Symmetry: C7
Subunit: 280 residues, 7 copies
């Protein structure tokens, strides 16, 4: 990248001959089961025209994948994490601005193949034309929500999943006979409904074992600011969907409702640029 313009590698980078004062802040929200981790670092370069503060948003959001309620032997429910989010807002009153952030949206790709085969038989000369298209489909998509001057956020959504090594079912899939089969253990089952759900081990790890974020947001502040202090708010949250299945006297049918429950864990941090330390 930088070496392609004939500039020596690392010349344009910053942080040289400086003393970065790092730190760490761990919080746990037992009500929502959302481990928090806000590792930061104050990079003060005399060459750079503004101060820096890279905020690492590590942590973990519990999957919370369990049957919330059961109604008899012919009806049951399941709540699973539809999407995890990590928002890092900054009051519009303050003069600090977010400079960069990572990861960011990337351009997809797909391979296209074309075929043209014709043969002869002894003579029924035939012709065949065919084209195939392939691409990768991650189970969860790390989408960077549109950032602005004071707010930056990420989200992880549910792309689709393969059930019992058959079919990439998704939230929008529907089958007139069986309905949505996203987490349906057996089709013509005879077992109790509450225990007719795909085992969490078979499902994706993030659904039950949780999602561990890893995001960065470097925020710069003017060096001649009147007040060297800016509070920041960091928000985690997960969105859960209710997956209902019931027996139609012939086979199980399953339905999924999108964005049923949403729980947000908000924390406020005070940054002291002069002291180069931010406190919980």
């Amino acid at each position: 990248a930088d070496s392609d313009i004939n500039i020596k590698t690392g010349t344009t980078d910053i942080g040289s001959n400086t003393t970065v004062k790092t730190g760490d802040l761990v919080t746990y929200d037992k009500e929502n089961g959302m481990h928090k981790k806000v590792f930061y670092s104050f990079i003060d370069d005399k060459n750079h025209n503004k101060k820096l503060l890279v905020i690492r948003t590590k942590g973990t959001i519990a999957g919370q994948y369990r049957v919330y309620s059961e109604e008899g032997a012919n009806k049951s429910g399941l709540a699973w994490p539809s999407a995890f989010k990590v928002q890092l807002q900054l009051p519009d009153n303050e003069v600090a601005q977010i400079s960069d952030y990572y990861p960011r949206n990337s351009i997809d790709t797909k391979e296209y193949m074309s075929t043209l085969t014709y043969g002869f038989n002894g003579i029924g000369a035939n012709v065949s034309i065919g084209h195939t298209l392939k691409y990768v489909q991650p189970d969860f998509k790390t989408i960077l929500e549109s950032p602005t001057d004071k707010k930056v956020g990420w989200k992880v959504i549910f792309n689709n999943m393969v059930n019992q090594n058959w079919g990439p079912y998704d939230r929008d899939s529907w089958n007139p006979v069986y309905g949505n089969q996203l987490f349906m253990k057996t089709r013509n089952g005879s077992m109790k409904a509450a225990d007719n759900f795909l085992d969490p081990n078979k499902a994706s790890s993030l659904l039950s074992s949780g999602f561990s974020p890893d995001f960065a947001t470097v925020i710069t502040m003017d060096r001649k600011a009147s007040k060297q202090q800016t509070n920041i708010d960091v928000i985690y949250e997960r969105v859960r969907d209710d997956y209902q299945l019931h027996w139609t006297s012939t086979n199980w049918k399953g339905t999924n409702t999108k964005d049923k429950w949403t729980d947000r864990s908000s924390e406020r941090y005070k940054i002291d640029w002069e002291k180069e330390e931010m406190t919980n």
Copy 2:
């Protein structure tokens, strides 16, 4: 590259034993939702015969993917980002010149395969001849617009997209029955038109979540210039297309109009070579 001519690696690069004064400038255009970031760096080498200034054009352009208007239950519209652009113009009056830039146009590639199979049966001896051709098709193409002495620009266009895991539709696709099906959720749908659009999550991330540029333009100025100051203009913009679909009493039909709306965000920066700092 450089090591192939027997020259020691990094010998021909510049920026050694020098003090680059980097910087940062963040602006947000809430009217157009276009985050801006003009990280720069002043590389002053005494060996090099001219001054340097590498301008990083980071930032983000919001996708702006939403149904702008709906007309009844049989007609609706959708505006999506057809192409993002980043232009970095320089007044022709000034004597500074752009030296390099990155990324640049690259040569495509494709694999070609040929087949020749003939067998016998017991005897209907047959012969088969076939050839296949495959290549990668990115959803968005990063095309570097033709640069000149005072102006350099980039653009990102819409190559094509795969809808519902079926067919790489593009802006020019047309089907006599259904028309352009670029963002058509369902063919024989019975739902309201305003809500018959492909979910933004299913579509590419750049359409709704925005595009984050990353470009570089090193501009050099004569060391004995009469005036050590040159203002520069940096322009972001996105081009949106209107995607109309209506019901023909039998099935949905969709049409796409190219380059319907264009919104440009222009900023002017003043560069002070003597002070080695450029201000907003």
Copy 3:
């Protein structure tokens, strides 16, 4: 990662110009055959706002794959390791907190391919539509159990196995004629039941030769704590399943019972932050 924000590589890392006092603690639980290894390291940075202690949880858990009992020539049993676990709990009374941990849950992936071929014959014009989906299936899955402020744990489960190069059988597989064939050497066998089990060499290595963990948990403590001492508990364990097979007078039938035996090996370690050493 860090270099993408234009920050020099390693600037935000910690541990510079400091003297880490490492160590080692080896224990063997001959009753359960679980080798233990708690290599640690005390990273005390004056820049960092808290002390650090990275605990490596190396060791080994014996597979314990043997025929526990046999009942005649028509019935036998087999106990195999269903899942290994490594838990690192910390008393809620103490003020130390776990900061990070590794490895962590990762997002799966799968390739999707679509085909569309139509030809002509001389004319029985045919059409073919087909799609294939492929993905990797590790025998054992390293799932990170939901962590919290005081407790972090890992587990390794039995995804599935290929028997005699035919079929990826798993714990839930069932065949009405033969039943679960997870470890069935021969279908229409005539040998003694106790010796009709898949040879441990043919099976996966972890089943019989054991599993060697490799996990890390960095725990940070406030620098101004009233008492510089916190005891910690580290737990290994394995879960074994009973695999019964018997003769139905026509062919062997096998059944598997999940989570039959569980054996836990617990050790308590005292950490002395002031001395920078933790003793068994």
Copy 4:
């Protein structure tokens, strides 16, 4: 390479413990739209027996892909860049010589596969013999023209292109019905001829957005030369082909004429070895 002869890496390279005086020279030929960039570097080693001067020939040649003229609604023309060239000549009078250059011609490669399958049916025993051959086909080929003592040149030619994801058409392709279909948007079109050309976005980037060279030519001069000064000439150029298509009352037909227009941009540079600087 060098390490395979047991010689320490970099021992045989040059440029150590020396002060290379680099530089830069930017010119723009608005008449032909050919950005120029002649970044150089004077490597003076006391160990090496001759002076060195590596000339980087960066820049850009505009694609110039547009419909030059239209004659009614049944005839039109198109001029596209057939091949870009970069020549670096040196007067035969001077005593300086070109030592090395990069890139250089490389040996192609291809995979060959052979098959032999015979089966039986119950018995019409058949036999099948088949072989397939695959290789990569870049759209543009970077051919290094035969160099000599005083002249070195490169050229980039048009290998072939894939049109509408169907067929790798080239300049020599011909079809009796439709003719050369290199840039034919539609076969049985009914639109005006001037607007029946493949969209430049669909075509390769280099055709319309231009080609950015990157070449190196190290030239050495005797250290005891009578005069320490040698002027050099650097030439860019592009060759354009006229692509005519007309309507035959039943379908469009297209023809291509090779090497219709050629425009050369020549610049002369004076090198001062004693001063270690070359001026425009």
Copy 5:
């Protein structure tokens, strides 16, 4: 690994600013043809709380692949190395413990692919469902035998082999007509039995040319031990199988007997921690 917890690379490693006293000990057991090599190294860190001694168990075990005896022209035998082992035991009396070891058991993997193709003919609409599963099968498996506090061992077993580019035969394979064909040169042979064995060159190299181990076992000792001396025993061995084949008057038949001969080469080494040298 270590860099993922934000810790600088190599911070948690040991051996810095210390003087390791390495060594070497070569022995040859001409009776069993087992070259021995016990390269060691005494890593004494003042920061580490215990001494270290990494024992490299290099060497070589001869294949010993030859026809041990022949009985007429219709019966012959062959002894081949079924499995190589390397054991490093330590007397239970001593207080030294093994800390780590390498290589260790690794989790296998396999790719699973599913297909679903249905077409139409003009109309005999057909449907096709198919799934394929692929995985790698090394000829020899390096299994780490269950380690303990005082004993660590490795073994290399015979997974399977491909004979005459046809079939991956193994020790358990059986064919009612020909029997086990692991090393059967020809099926309907007419040559003497003693010379009807697969040429050792065609077979795997390890069978005849031997196996060269490469293993490591770091053992730590308390720094305040009463006596600074611990003797160690290192054992090599190979297990050979007798492969008998005889003529049944119509075709050759081969049978394999497992673990026929076992030869162990044991050596005892005395370690002097105070002197930092261990003698044969």
Copy 6:
């Protein structure tokens, strides 16, 4: 390589703490169009027991691919470079010896695949056996001719080429109807013979644009030699084949004659070990 014997990387290499006096010698043979480049380097190590001199044989041999003569409209000829060579001889009188050289002969490789498929139909149970073999076929082979004490040489030969994306024709190919079709543009052509040759652009680059060698030969001389001077001869050459094609009144026929013309360019260099410089 060296690190596998536990020796620190680069320990056994030479050239440390020494001053290598490099150089350069450029010659051009306008009669044969063979650019020459003999970059050298005198590595004098006091630890090494002999002097060293690595001779780089860079340069370029022009392709010389043109129709040498035409005889009417039914006969024509073509001369193309059959093989390039680079020989570096040393007089047998001198006491200097060649120590090493690079590149060297490498062992080829090929993948072998075997298949065995049998199915049933409802029942015409069939069986299919098939095997495929694939390998890479470079157009030109870099063969190192057998070296000796005083002479080392390389050669590049014509393996085969693919013509019009159909068939890998070679010098030995023959077809009874059309003959050798190595460079036959059209089969049933009606154009003049002199202009019925494959365009040089379509052919391989080395045929017309030339071949650029890159070879190394380190030669060592006794340190106590009576005379510190040894002259050396370096020879380039190309071998050209005459490709004749004529019309048989029905179709073109082509024939190739091997090794028709050979042109050698020889240069003699005098080496002065005491002065550490070799002159043209």
Copy 7:
């Protein structure tokens, strides 16, 4: 490897802060055409308990691929290199021992794939079961012959070769009609027998152009030995096979005889540990 035990990379390696006295010895055996090269290095570490001497066995063995004799126009012969060897023996009287050596035997690998496809037709429900197995087959195998305390040797054998892009023939192949076709240019040829052999260019390079070894053998000697001097013997050799083919009045038949000629080139070197130099 070493870093996995938490030991810093390179800690356990040797050769630090020491002065290795390298060397070189070149010999040529014109009688057998076997270039010799015995580059060595004396690594004397004060930490290591024994001296070291790594012997590089570079060189080259000429292929010697030519028709040794011809008997009329219906019989001819060909001698080709069946296998190259490099032996490095050491007198049993001396006390020096070989410590290590490289390369060493490696474990092969192969991929196994299984298929199971069943479809329906409208209904002739069919079932298909198939498995494929693929692996790489180098033309020449570098087998390390069983080493011992005083002797270490390598050999390179002839695995198999592909003739005319058809069939991997080997020394053991036999066809009742044509016989062994290893080097048979044409089957139903009518040319003289002496000139009916596969062109050496088409064959593998090592057969005619020779094989260039690259082997290492580090030998250690006790530091308190009574005499600091040990002579060593290094042996090259090649084994040639006689390939006879004759005409049976209908087609060519070829036969191969294994190990017809063997030529050994032996050299004796005297090592002076005290002087740290070994002389020819």
